[PDB]
Amino acid sequence: PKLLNKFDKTIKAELDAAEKLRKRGKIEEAVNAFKELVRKYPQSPRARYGKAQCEDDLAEKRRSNEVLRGAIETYQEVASLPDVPADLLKLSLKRRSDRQQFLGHMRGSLLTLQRLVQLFPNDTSLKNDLGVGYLLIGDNDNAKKVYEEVLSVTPNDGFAKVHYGFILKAQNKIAESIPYLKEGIESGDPGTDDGRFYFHLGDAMQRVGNKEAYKWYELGHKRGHFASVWQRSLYNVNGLKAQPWWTPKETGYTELVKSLERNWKLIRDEGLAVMDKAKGLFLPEDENLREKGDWSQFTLWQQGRRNENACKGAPKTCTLLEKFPETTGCRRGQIKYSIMHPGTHVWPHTGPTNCRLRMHLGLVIPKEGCKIRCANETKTWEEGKVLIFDDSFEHEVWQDASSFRLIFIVDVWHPELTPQQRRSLPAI
């Protein structure tokens, strides 16, 4: 790569030093060197480019945005000087865009990418990156137009294909998204071996009733994107017993389970009263997971935080749960009532973390028609009885009964997490 043009080429003899004072790892040296060559040879592009790469690394070191924000401008400075090597120009603005994205300046990074495409209107790689810039600001229509131009010129570019598929899927063109994601992934091209595209390919296939989704999930597993073909959560802790269904005894949380089973009519009655008196406290569940039907939830604890207005409506239930911080303190979980009406189907999905187990207490369960699957096992609820599964494993639900189904959902920390783990895990 030709980063040295005439104007600089003369004074390369000293350039090598500064860059190796970096490679050496003596960043302090490298910075001051390049800064000194900045004043000795203002005009030099490589001189600038060096000061910026120094600042970039000195920021990773100190972990200082303020620092990195300095580099982002110096990368811009490389691109103001004259007869700047196009290799070096591409390099510097590519890095600025990346660093802009790192800090959250998505539109700023888009502007940089827009500039690079104007400078280099035949670099496909840069158009691909521009489309990401558009995605990162939510402008999928302009991202769609970019990947269409690329595909018009390079019809087998896997990076554009998988991104085109994503955009199609997000425009509710689900069946059309699938071959784009399949072919992009199978191209093996750089940037296509990303767990997000396996996730979307399998979701799309499931949603059009294509059993081949699990092949791709298994391939995702083999490629490191998923714990297994069934357990596909994103935010995981290693070393936690992984099984879809659990018994109370297996969890150790036997006193919690007893308190829920033994006081279940109280728990029921408070929820039914909120249904009757404050029905708008039950909020509609995830529209994305809802194929059809009527499905709503009344949350008492969100990520370790008590909802106080909720507990004024379910006072005795909240008071009961206070005794069990394995759930009230589960920052990766929830505690919520959940009502599902006839004609409801919940798409197969997993939750976000393997750090919780999900308990379901049955409160109002019609005698036929309600069922939940987790992995290969399909079960049903019972009034006053708790079911426990690991919702990081794919689960799916159906409500084909003649009246409403009410359950009570209680997340607990995975029982193998140690107290210090429970204490230090970020919430989600």
Ligand X SMILES: O=C(O)C(=O)C[C@@H](O)C(=O)O
Residues tagged in the binding site annotation: 295, 338, 349, 358-360, 395, 405
216's tokens: 């791709």
- DSSP conformation letters of 30-86: HHHHHHHHHHHSTT-HHHHHHHHHHHHHHHHHHT-HHHHHHHHHHHHHHTTSTT--H
397 lies in the binding site for ligand X (CB under 6 A)? yes
356 lies in the binding site for ligand X (CB under 6 A)? no
Using CB under 6 A as the binding criterion, the count of chain residues that bind ligand X stands at 9
Quick one: which segment of 24-32, 54-62, 208-216, 389-397 binds ligand X (CB under 6 A)?
Answer: 389-397
390 lies in the binding site for ligand X (CB under 6 A)? no
Which helix (DSSP H) or strand (DSSP E) does residue 296 occupy?
A: strand 295-302
Residue 235 Cβ vs ligand X, minimum distance, rounded to whole Å: 16
357 lies in the binding site for ligand X (CB under 6 A)? no
330 lies in the binding site for ligand X (CB under 6 A)? no
395 lies in the binding site for ligand X (CB under 6 A)? yes
358 lies in the binding site for ligand X (CB under 6 A)? yes
Quick one: which segment of 32-40, 146-154, 390-398, 411-419 binds ligand X (CB under 6 A)?
Answer: 390-398
| CA trace torsion 225, 354, 345, 388 (10° rounding) | 150
Residue 391 Cβ vs ligand X, minimum distance, rounded to whole Å: 5
Question: Which residue lies nearer to ligand X by CB, 72 or 260?
Answer: 260
88 lies in the binding site for ligand X (CB under 6 A)? no
Annotated binding-site ranges for 2-oxoglutarate: 295, 338, 358-360, 405
User: Are 283 and 337 spatial neighbours (Cβ–Cβ below 8 Å)?
Assistant: no
Phi/psi at 290 (nearest 5 deg)?
-95, 105
Residue 296 Cβ vs ligand X, minimum distance, rounded to whole Å: 9
Cα separation, 290 vs 30, whole angstroms: 56
Per DSSP, helices labelled H in 278-418 are 308-313, 315-321, 325-328
* Nearest residue to 21 (alpha-carbon basis) of 56, 64, 50: 50
Cβ-closest residue to ligand X? 338
Question: Which residue lies nearer to ligand X by CB, 131 or 351?
Answer: 351
Sign of CA dihedral 87, 92, 95, 100: negative
For helices 124-136 and 158-170, the axis angle rounded to 10 degrees is 20
Cα separation, 88 vs 44, whole angstroms: 12
Question: Which residue lies nearer to ligand X by CB, 386 or 397?
Answer: 397
User: Are 163 and 182 spatial neighbours (Cβ–Cβ below 8 Å)?
Assistant: no
409 lies in the binding site for ligand X (CB under 6 A)? yes
Residue 385 Cβ vs ligand X, minimum distance, rounded to whole Å: 15
For helices 195-207 and 174-186, the axis angle rounded to 10 degrees is 140
Phi/psi at 303 (nearest 5 deg)?
50, 50
340 lies in the binding site for ligand X (CB under 6 A)? yes
User: Are 224 and 201 spatial neighbours (Cβ–Cβ below 8 Å)?
Assistant: no
- How many residues are given for the chain? 428
Question: Which residue lies nearer to ligand X by CB, 332 or 395?
Answer: 395
Question: Which residue lies nearer to ligand X by CB, 128 or 399?
Answer: 399
346 lies in the binding site for ligand X (CB under 6 A)? yes
412 lies in the binding site for ligand X (CB under 6 A)? no
Question: Which residue lies nearer to ligand X by CB, 51 or 358?
Answer: 358
Question: Which residue lies nearer to ligand X by CB, 57 or 411?
Answer: 411
391 lies in the binding site for ligand X (CB under 6 A)? yes
338 lies in the binding site for ligand X (CB under 6 A)? yes
List the x/- string, 159-198, binding to ligand X by CB under 6 A: ----------------------------------------
Quick one: which segment of 25-33, 136-144, 164-172, 391-399 binds ligand X (CB under 6 A)?
Answer: 391-399
User: Are 71 and 63 spatial neighbours (Cβ–Cβ below 8 Å)?
Assistant: no
* Nearest residue to 334 (alpha-carbon basis) of 360, 316, 309, 315: 360
Question: Which residue lies nearer to ligand X by CB, 178 or 407?
Answer: 407
Question: Which residue lies nearer to ligand X by CB, 114 or 303?
Answer: 303
Which helix (DSSP H) or strand (DSSP E) does residue 284 occupy?
A: strand 283-284
Annotated binding-site ranges for Fe cation: 349, 395
Q: Applying CB under 6 A, which residues contact ligand X?
A: 338, 340, 346, 358, 391, 395, 397, 407, 409
